[PDB]
Amino acid sequence: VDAGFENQKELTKMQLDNQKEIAEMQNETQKEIAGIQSATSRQNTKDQVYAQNEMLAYQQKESTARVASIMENTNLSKQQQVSEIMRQMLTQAQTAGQYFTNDQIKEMTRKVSAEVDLVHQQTQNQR
Amino acid sequence: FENQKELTKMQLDNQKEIAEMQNETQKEIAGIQSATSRQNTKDQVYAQNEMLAYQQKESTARVASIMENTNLSKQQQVSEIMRQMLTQAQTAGQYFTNDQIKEMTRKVSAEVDLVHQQTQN
Amino acid sequence: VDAGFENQKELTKMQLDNQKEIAEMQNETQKEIAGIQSATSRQNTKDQVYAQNEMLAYQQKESTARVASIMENTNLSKQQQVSEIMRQMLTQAQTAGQYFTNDQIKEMTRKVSAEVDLVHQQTQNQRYG
Amino acid sequence: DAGFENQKELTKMQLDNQKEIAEMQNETQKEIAGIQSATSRQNTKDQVYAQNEMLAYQQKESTARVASIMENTNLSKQQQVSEIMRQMLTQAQTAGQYFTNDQIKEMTRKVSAEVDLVHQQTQNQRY
Amino acid sequence: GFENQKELTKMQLDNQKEIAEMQNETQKEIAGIQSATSRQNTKDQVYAQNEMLAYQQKESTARVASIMENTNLSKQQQVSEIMRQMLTQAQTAGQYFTNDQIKEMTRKVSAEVDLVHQQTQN
Amino acid sequence: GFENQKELTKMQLDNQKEIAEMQNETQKEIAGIQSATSRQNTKDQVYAQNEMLAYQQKESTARVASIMENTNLSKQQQVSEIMRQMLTQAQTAGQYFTNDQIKEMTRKVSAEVDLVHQQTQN
Amino acid sequence: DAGFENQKELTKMQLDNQKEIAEMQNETQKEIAGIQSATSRQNTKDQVYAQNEMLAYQQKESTARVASIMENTNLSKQQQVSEIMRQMLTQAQTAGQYFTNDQIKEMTRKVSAEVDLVHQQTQNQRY
Amino acid sequence: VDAGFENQKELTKMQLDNQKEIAEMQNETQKEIAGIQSATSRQNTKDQVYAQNEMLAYQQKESTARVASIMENTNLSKQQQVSEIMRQMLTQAQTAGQYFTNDQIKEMTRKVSAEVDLVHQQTQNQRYG
Amino acid sequence: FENQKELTKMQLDNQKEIAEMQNETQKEIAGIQSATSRQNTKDQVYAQNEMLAYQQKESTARVASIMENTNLSKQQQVSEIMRQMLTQAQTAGQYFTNDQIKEMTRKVSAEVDLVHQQTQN
Amino acid sequence: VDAGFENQKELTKMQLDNQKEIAEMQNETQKEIAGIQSATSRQNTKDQVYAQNEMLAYQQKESTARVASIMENTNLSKQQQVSEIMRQMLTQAQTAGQYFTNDQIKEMTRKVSAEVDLVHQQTQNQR
Structure with missing residues (x-):
């Protein structure tokens, strides 16, 4: 029942428990940090999307x-x-009408010319 | 066995104290980073929100x-x-007007002959 | 008060405090770097949103x-x-008006036609005398 | 060698401590990753919500x-x-405008002649 | 003898720190480089919008x-x-009165047709 | 005696590896999580453009x-x-001929003024 | 203790090696950072070139x-x-349209009366 | 052939090969992770550019x-x-035409005025008889 | 002094061999990352370039x-x-037309009196 | 001139030179990698900005x-x-004109009414 070695098996145990407790503290710290990051990322997203949802x-x-x-x-x-x-x-009817009006214009021109000759001769005859 | 356990205990209490303040620093730095992220985001969305x-x-x-x-x-x-x-009515009217235009042309022609023969006299 | 233990407690303390002061200086470096980073990020964003805010x-x-x-x-x-x-x-009234006008157009055509006959007659009477 | 059993045993304490530490660090990394994943999924859904709607x-x-x-x-x-x-229609109308140009000129001659007649009348009535 | 433990140990301990010091100084200089770069990139980026x-x-x-x-x-x-x-209401009433006038004027044209015909028949 | 050096050493060596194995397995599972997440985010993101x-x-x-x-x-x-x-060219020539007609018609109106006056003077 | 000088010396070899290693790692980190910086500056300039132009x-x-x-x-x-x-102008024109409505009605009465006259003429000429 | 050296050459080799096989397995893990990452990134981008390419x-x-x-x-x-x-x-011709027309308007006004005098005269002659 | 120098030399040749293959792996992985980056970029700019x-x-x-x-x-x-x-000419014309409108009104009025007195007869 | 310690000062030297050469190899590798990254980043940027520059x-x-x-x-x-x-x-002149036209419309209406009475009496007198 070796006392010196039980002593070594108290020293060693103290070292390994120190190591373990430390590792746990670091893990707790890292989880805490990720929680902070996640909450910030979520709040930034909600803030960003507010406008577009309204x-x-x-x-x-x-x-x-x-x-x-x-x-x-x-x-x-x-x-x-x-x-x-x-x-x-309507445009087709109006086109035909303009052509007939063309023929009439020519006839009216002959008539005006003849009236010119008539008024000329009346003017000579009054003179 | 007490003095050696004590040399040990000081080694480990140191180790642990370094680790606590290391973690402490890590949390502080994330605090700064979060606050900066939130603030930037706010300033960014200010205009669209306004x-x-x-x-x-x-x-x-x-x-x-x-x-x-x-x-x-x-x-x-x-x-x-x-x-x-209205347009359908106007189109029918244009067709009737076409016939009228032609009669009026014949009439004008006939008036030409009668002006002619008026001009001798 | 045995010499060995106390002298190696000395020796050990030298190391523990060197590693603690190393770690402290490291943390200090970390926090400073983070401060510089944050200030940069803030000034960047302000500079970025200047125009839109303006x-x-x-x-x-x-x-x-x-x-x-x-x-x-x-x-x-x-x-x-x-x-x-x-x-x-107005358009409805005008449409009815165009229809009445269509009938008037046909009557006027008949009239012109009759007037043509009259002009031919006058012409012929002038020739005949 | 029932003695070295003891030296082995402290060593066994050391390896086991090492691995349970490692395992807890691993489960920690996994948990952090899952937090990050759920956050990223949530952000994405909040982001695409408007366009999807x-x-x-x-x-x-x-x-x-x-x-x-x-x-x-x-x-x-x-x-x-x-x-x-x-x-x-425009073609028909251009032709009509040319015939109308000739008519305008004849009608002008007629107006001129009528001016000569009115003048003669006025002259006869004045003296 | 032990004092020279206390020289070797010091030499190790102080080399540790001088190394850590060179490393921190490097970290800080790198951060300063990155920061300066980032700030200047931003200036270059916002120039046009600002102008x-x-x-x-x-x-x-x-x-x-x-x-x-x-x-x-x-x-x-x-x-x-x-x-x-x-104006449009007034014009609509005007169109209705005009509609009646159109009908009367048609009647007149028809009667004039009979007159012109009778004048040619005799 | 040495053989039990060769037991202790093995125990240390193999603990090293089993630890490294658990760590690699963790790395791979984390990567798979991140990959799956990234792929699904992308699907969610491109849904609307695709539709x-x-x-x-x-x-x-x-x-x-x-x-x-x-x-x-x-x-x-x-x-x-x-x-x-x-049509416009033709209308321009027409306007010029019309300009002359306007002048002649004015002369006619003036002469008619003299006629109407003389008719009232007697 | 001219002997321990030797044990110190191997130790001195060890610390100096450690620091020249560390220093070369540091200069390396610095050089990498400078490469990254020049690259980032170049990318930015290439990026903003178009908008600036x-x-x-x-x-x-x-x-x-x-x-x-x-x-x-x-x-x-x-x-x-x-x-x-x-x-x-529109106001003036609306008033004009109302006066024109009365005129339209009177002119209709006139046309009607002229119809009665033409009819009477026709009747007298027919029998 | 002294026992110590050879037996601790054994002992040493056990460690060197454990650390080499550890490192090999690590590298293998790294390259696999990188493969998965690359495939993900590629498939992502393809999925992203599908629409624009379409x-x-x-x-x-x-x-x-x-x-x-x-x-x-x-x-x-x-x-x-x-x-x-x-x-x-056309507009230039029309402008000149409007001016000639302005003078014609004034002459026509004079005419109407004269016609008013004539109508008054006719009226008065009718009253006088 | 040869056997111990040799135990040493094997330790260090191992160390170095691990480091070479570690570096080797790092370069390989960056190769994959570069190739992936270039390829993604290409596929991205394809449309705008086309x-x-x-x-x-x-x-x-x-x-x-x-x-x-x-x-x-x-x-x-x-x-x-x-x-x-053209508009200035038309405005002057409208003013002359205004005067004409008024004379024409007087004329119409006078014609009213003469229609009246024509109607007794 | 201690041979055993000179031997230790050959062993140690071998270890430290191993360490140093390794550190250099790792540094060379890291610089090489950053070179690859920088060249890829530059090539991606040039590829991206092509379109906008043209x-x-x-x-x-x-x-x-x-x-x-x-x-x-x-x-x-x-x-x-x-x-x-x-x-x-022009609009001001036209507005005045429409008012004068209004007055005229009323006068014309009185005239038409009077013509109605005249044509009526002619029709009675022919009858």
Whole structure:
């Protein structure tokens, strides 16, 4: 029952328990630090995303409103196409009319010239 | 066995004291780093956060305006329909006008002959 | 009071205090480095956000101005809707008018035609006399 | 050698202490990693939340825009036809304007002649 | 003899510290290098935004004055829409009275057709 | 005796390795955790862009067809500008001839003034 | 104790070796840091080059835009005045349209009466 | 061949090879971890650039279409310049015409005035008879 | 003194061999990291690089168009000047027309009296 | 001249030179690695900035062109303001004219009514 070696087995035990307690303290410190880091990272993220989340409800209502308006633009476009077709038909009638008006202009020109000769001869005859 | 246990105990109490103050320093430094991170983040998001409310009431105003454009568009669709009908009537009228133009041309021609023969006299 | 133990307690203390003073100087170096780092990071961020913070007030009064203009656009749009409705009624009246006018055009054509016959007649009477 | 058993035993105390220390350091590293992972996942979800929430709105607005764009295309085609009709009306009208230029000149001669007649009348009535 | 334990030990202990001192000094100089670098990078990075700030501000002020004038114009356009609504109502009533006139004038043209015909028939 | 040096040494040597083995295994598990996390973050991040891709593509295709029709319309508008240039030249010559007519018609109105006056004077 | 001098000397060999090693490791850390610094500076300059080169262009374009914006403001004021003038023209025209409505009705009575006259003429000429 | 040296050469080799095999296993762990990291980073980036690469071809034909439209806008703008020049000439002719027309307006005013006198005269002659 | 120097020499040759293969591994791992960084960067800049040329010829087209807008604007300034002059002439004409409107009103009034007295007869 | 201690001073020297050579090898390795990192970082940066630099010359010419166009818009705006003033004056003249036209419309209405009475009495008198 060796007293000197039991003494060595008290010394050694003191050293190893010192080592272990230290290792635990360092581990506790590291976990504590990671907790601080994680909480800071989370708080930074929440702070960053605040703006975009609030804006979010507003952006959704604007988009829904825009959809209704865009669909009405699509309908206006369909009506405008119908209007274009009708107006094409009016333009075709007006084109034919301008040609007939052209023929008439020439006839009216001959008439004016003849009236010129008439007024000339009246003027001679009064003179 | 007491003096040697004591040489030991001083070695270990030192070791432990170094480790405590090392850990202490590590926690301090993370404290500084956290405080700096939080503060930078705040200063960064300051502007977007300050613009929030302006952007919101501007968006709401825009919603009201867009809805009024939707209403104007519906009225315009109706107007296109009214104008479609007016245009059909005007096209038929242009065709009748075409015939009138031709009769009027014959009339003008005939008036030319009668001016002519008026001019001898 | 045995010489060995006390003299190697001396020897041991020399080492324990050298390692403690080494560790203290190390910690001091760590905290200083961290201070320099933090100050750098802060000054960086301030320098980064200067412009956006500066533009803030301008952006706000411009936004408020735009709101007033948008609301007036809304009001104008309402007035235009009323104008569209009145103009629809005018157009409807004008369409009916164009139809009545179409019939008038045909009657006038008949008239011109009859006047042509009259002019030919006058011409022929002039020739005949 | 029942004696060296003792020297071995202190040594066994030393190795076991070493490994339970190492194992606790390992479990610590693992726990830290898991904290960091949960934090990173949470940050990401908080970050992508807004864009994910706008998705459906953006898609339905895009579908509305596609329909409108296609109707604009149809209108563009009708307008091309209208431009063509109108090129022809313009052609007819240019020809008419040239015939009208000749008519303007003849009508001017007529007005001139009427001036001569009115002058003669005035002269006859004055003396 | 022991005193020379106390010389060897000192030599070891002090070499330890002088080494640690050189190492700390190195750490600090490296940090200073990195800090200076980081600060200068930031200056280089923010130069352009800072130099554009004043232009952006005065442009924003100009835009504000313009936006306010557009607001005033919109109010004037609203009043104009109102005046024009009244003109359009009056024109609609005018078109209805005109519709009746068109019908009477047609009747007149028809009767004139009969007159011209009868004048040629005799 | 020495053989038991060769037992103590082995016990130390093998404890060394079993410790190193537990440590490597820990390293690998940590890396796997980080990798999985990183990959899943990326999936979460790219979800929306990926889900919008198809809408963006078909919208782009629609826009292309529309842009091409605008190009065709622009060509038609150019031709229209040309036709209208010719009409405008003709109208300018017409305005010059009309200018002369205006002067003659004024002379006529003046003479008619003298006629009406002389008719009232007697 | 000229003997322990020897034991000291091996020890001196050991400390000096330790420090020249440490010093070379230090100079190495410094050199690495300087490489990293020059690299970071170069990257930054290469990065900001484009924006710095666009600066002057953006500024002069902004000055041009300011001048244009201010002229738009002046035009807006003139247009406000034009809207006002035109409100008044429109007012005058609305009043005119009401007087014209009464005129339209009287002219209709006249046309009607002329129809009665033409009819009577036709009747007299027919029988 | 002395027992001490050889037996502690044995003892020493046990340690040197334990530390070499420890280091080898460590390196192996390092390289594996690095492989996993690299594969993760690559797969991440691919996953990140998928969309932009997908949109590439669409963006290119849209850009080419826009180029054709812009060039046609350029051509149209040239035609509009020519139209502006012709219309300037028409406007100049119309301005001269408005001035001649102004004088005609004044002469017509004089005429109406004279006609008023004539109508009063006719009225008075009707009363007088 | 040879056997002990040899126990030593084996210890140190081991030490050195571990260090060589440790360094070797470090260089290998940096090789992997570099290759991964270069490859990611390439894949990242692929799209912007592929769009480069399209963006350039589109920009050039835009330059030509903008320059034509500048020319059209100059012509429009001239047109505004022509229209300014036409407008002044039209305003003077409107004033002369105003006087004519008033004479024509007096004339119409006088014609009213003469219609009246024509109606007894 | 102690041979055994000179022997210790050959052993020790071998150990310390081993240590030093190793430290140098590790340093050389670390510098090599930093060289690899720096070159990769530089190549990544150049690759990244390629696009924006090329674009840069094109962006500068577009901006210069835009400046010329914006300045011409400013000039057009000044002319349009002059045009607005002239048109205000025309609108004022036209407003006065519409009022005079209003008075005339009333007079014309009285005249038409009187012509109605006249045509009525002619129709009675032919009957």
